Design a protein around this nucleic acid. Structure first.
Ligand SMILES: [Zn+2]
Lengths: 148, 121, 171, 191, 52, 67
RNA sequence: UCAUCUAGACAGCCGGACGGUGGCCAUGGAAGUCGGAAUCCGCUAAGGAGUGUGUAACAACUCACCGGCCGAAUGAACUAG
């Protein structure tokens, strides 16, 4: 009946939102932690659907999160709170898979465009072994079929 | 630069008129960009939606008047906020989709031009 | 004064190392031949390494207007020295001949910028052959279709010191 | 730069008749008539087709062509003032002492008197210019309405009533008491 | 307390002005130059100091 | 009734306007205005009266009611 | 000297001013608007990884951009009489 969406780093305020729904903070956190597992390590959007008794947690797909996950990352404690700059391989297939995963959610203009947008989302990630992310996307028509 | 962008608009419009026999003139009032974007996605397969400055459009039609003379009839209808829908589908199916989508408190089809014939509809 | 246009052609004095110098030519607006040749040597001392003692003038000819009864629009490019610096200006004048156009130009610069004849340099003057290349509103005003206007408030100067009726300024 | 011809237009509705000898304008309408001397401004008038009048100036400077649009606005204000009329609504503003406003008659001259403005014993009297009618409006608390044909007379009377209630020797950002004009419009607005 | 709308109407004439920095003149709030001759129509203007 | 203005027309300067030369070498002949230079001077021609085609200041001529 | 301009300019009204995306670090928080860097796509007629107001963070409002009315020149910086 009520849906609440939050961006949560996995493995874990939440209580303030929970009080309105009369749901235990610990219970919500545990459910979210289980959902995050899928990748985890990094912040991801979490959707909680409340049935008026309990809240169900799912991880909504996000381009940044999917891209960050795709870049292989050594697990980081974050106690250090280091810059943790992300460097990534081209991962052309993964991005195409990500575009397909988006599946033009929220109406991406084209399958190729969804991939191009996914490439732009990698502002943070290097996204290529030797190139600026999405610099060659205009140049190469390859993988347009793969995104669809 | 400004002229160059403008020149491209003139060309695309000419191509669109040639490509689709059916033309729908749609008036948009208080329609959000998001509302417009959704309509475009729903009709991407069967329809083309064009938005432009009227002053720019009228000159284009006059410029392209020698070819496609029947399109001249559309010019009186062009006045006021307008949009152009170019579609393979003949009439009602497109019209039903446009009006229904995104009505919130609202796209309207002011006039329909098909095959040199204008329908108030 | 009332200006005239001259072409002045001169050269350096011929030497054994170089006979036949290159015969430079310039167009001067001046009152007479003496002022024209003085301005010619002034601008050649500004341009090339020559002076009057080292050179000579081979020709001076008055160039009168080809069509003195055609109404033209002229664009004039001018350098002038102000009290603080040197500036370039472009002014355009609707008038019937080149010498009268530069006369009104000299009056206009002396009136509006207090620039004197010694401070004004005439870069060039050229007839604008086409309308809508006219860029100033004060001359573009007179190029409209069926131009007509009245002359309000006629003042007639009298010969007598006493007038025997109240005058009228109808035109 | 000596603009050799600049020219404005005024539209004459069906009910009014405008008479212009030398530069004296008389506008006659349903609500009455108004007149205006304009011999200080040096323009020329020209009737086109009995509902349009052009006003023009020839060989005018910048100030002169400013005065042309000014005189167009004045004669157009006169026309719309004799057709629709003019109505200024003002509101009374007080903190503690209520402002008590009435209409009195010294030698039959229709004075507006203002009592108890910030509790003083002084009585402020403002005269009423002719052609201006004043009604203390019902159903809105503490509101006065001045109506007439001349915008000059109505707005000047409203301004005199506003300026007569100024506060002295106090912080006027805190002592906001007075009578302030809140609305300007027509008697037959949205006609 | 006056009323909120009536405080707005009175402050329109009393508080929502600008002040010339040179000659202290009370000026329109959207003005660019002072209307007075003695300061030379200067463009040094500041908002009128509010309370609170 | 109907709106009444005083028209106050006077003697516009345009092409084809006949003028009388007030002072100068002609000084009393008729000419026709051929073109308008600026606000203060015009190009006239008076070919029947023997006035040569010339630019002239408007203060040296008088405009006639003839067009 | 730069720009805009009858293919519609500048004022004034009215409408939209969107998704990827709560872009990446960092914070108890900061989602365009505490900061550090980058500052890219889609849909476009058009919309900044934001001009301000703005909240704990949101939300909300407004912008610079595009559109209807207007139909023709206008904006910024600087120079000197
Ligand atoms: Zn001042």
């Amino acid at each position: 009946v009520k849906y609440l969406y939050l961006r949560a780093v996995g493995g874990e305020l939440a209580p303030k939102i929970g009080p309105l729904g009369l749901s235990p903070k610990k219970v919500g956190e545990d459910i979210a932690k289980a959902t995050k597992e899928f990748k985890g390590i990094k912040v991801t959007v979490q959707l909680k659907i409340q049935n008026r008794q309990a809240a169900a947690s799912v991880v909504p797909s996000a381009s940044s999160l999917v891209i960050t996950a795709l870049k292989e990352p050594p697990r980081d404690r974050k106690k250090d709170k280091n810059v943790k700059h992300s460097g990534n391989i081209q991962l052309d297939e993964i991005i195409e898979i990500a575009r397909q995963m988006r599946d033009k959610s929220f109406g991406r203009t084209l399958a190729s465009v969804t991939k191009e947008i996914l490439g732009t989302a990698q502002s943070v990630g290097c996204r290529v072994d030797f190139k600026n992310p999405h610099d060659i996307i205009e140049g190469i028509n390859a993988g347009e079929i793969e995104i669809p | 630069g400004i002229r160059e962008k403008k020149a491209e608009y003139f060309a695309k419009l000419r191509e669109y008129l040639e490509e689709y026999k059916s033309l729908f003139v749609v008036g948009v009032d208080n329609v959000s960009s998001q509302q417009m974007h959704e309509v475009r996605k729903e009709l991407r397969g069967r329809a083309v939606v064009l938005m432009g400055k009227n002053t720019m459009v009228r000159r284009a039609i006059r410029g392209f008047l020698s070819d496609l003379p029947d399109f001249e009839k559309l010019l009186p209808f062009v006045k006021g906020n307008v949009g152009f829908v170019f579609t393979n589908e003949p009439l009602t199916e497109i019209k039903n989709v446009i009006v229904s989508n995104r009505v919130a408190a609202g796209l309207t089809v002011v006039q329909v031009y098909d095959n040199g014939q204008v329908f108030p509809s | 004064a009332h200006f005239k246009e001259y072409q002045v052609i001169g050269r350096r004095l011929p030497t054994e190392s170089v006979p036949e110098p290159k015969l430079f030519r310039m167009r001067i607006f001046a009152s007479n031949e003496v002022i024209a040749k003085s301005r010619y040597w002034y601008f050649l001392q500004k341009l090339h390494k020559v002076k009057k003692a080292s050179g000579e003038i081979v020709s001076i000819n008055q160039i009168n207007e080809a069509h003195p009864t055609k109404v033209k629009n002229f664009g004039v490019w001018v350098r002038y020295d102000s009290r603080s610096g040197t500036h370039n200006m472009y002014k355009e004048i609707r008038d019937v001949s080149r010498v009268a156009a530069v006369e009104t130009l000299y009056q206009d610069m002396a009136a509006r910028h207090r620039a004197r004849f010694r401070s004004i340099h005439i870069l060039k003057v050229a007839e604008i052959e086409k309308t809508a290349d006219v860029k100033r509103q004060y001359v573009k005003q007179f190029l409209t279709k069926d131009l007509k206007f009245p002359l309000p408030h006629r003042v007639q100067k009298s010969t007598k010191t006493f007038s025997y009726k109240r005058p009228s300024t109808f035109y | 730069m000596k603009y050799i011809q600049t020219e404005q237009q005024i539209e004459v509705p069906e009910g009014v008749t405008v008479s212009i000898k030398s530069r004296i304008v008389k506008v006659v309408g349903p609500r009455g008539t108004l007149t205006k001397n304009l011999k200080h401004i040096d323009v020329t008038f020209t009737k086109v087709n009995n509902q349009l009048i052009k006003v023009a100036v020839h060989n005018g400077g910048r100030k002169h062509v400013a005065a042309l649009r000014t005189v167009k606005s004045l004669v157009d204000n006169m026309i719309t003032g004799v057709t629709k009329g003019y109505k200024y609504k003002m509101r009374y503003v007080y903190a503690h002492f209520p402002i008590n406003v009435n209409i009195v008659e010294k030698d039959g001259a229709k004075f507006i008197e203002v009592r108890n403005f910030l509790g003083d014993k002084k009585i402020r009297n403002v005269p009423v210019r002719d052609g201006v009618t004043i009604e203390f409006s019902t159903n809105v608390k503490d509101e006065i309405v001045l109506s007439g044909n001349s915008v000059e007379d109505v707005s000047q009377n409203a301004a005199d009533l506003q300026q007569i209630c100024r506060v002295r020797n106090k912080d006027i950002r805190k002592f906001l008491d007075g009578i302030y004009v809140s609305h300007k419009g027509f008697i037959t607005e949205d006609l | 307390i006056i009323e909120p709308s009536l405080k707005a109407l009175a402050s329109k004439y009393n508080c929502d002005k600008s002040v010339c920095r040179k000659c202290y003149a009370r000026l329109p709030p959207r003005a660019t130059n002072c209307r007075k001759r003695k300061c030379g129509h200067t463009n040094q203007l500041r908002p009128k100091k509010k309370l609170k | 009734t109907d709106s009444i203005v005083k028209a106050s027309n006077w003697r516009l300067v345009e092409v084809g306007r006949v003028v009388l030369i007030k002072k100068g070498q002609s000084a009393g002949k008729l000419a026709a205005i051929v073109e308008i230079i600026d606000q203060k001077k015009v190009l006239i021609d008076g070919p029947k009266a023997g006035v040569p085609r010339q630019a002239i200041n408007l203060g040296q001529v008088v405009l006639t009611p003839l067009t």
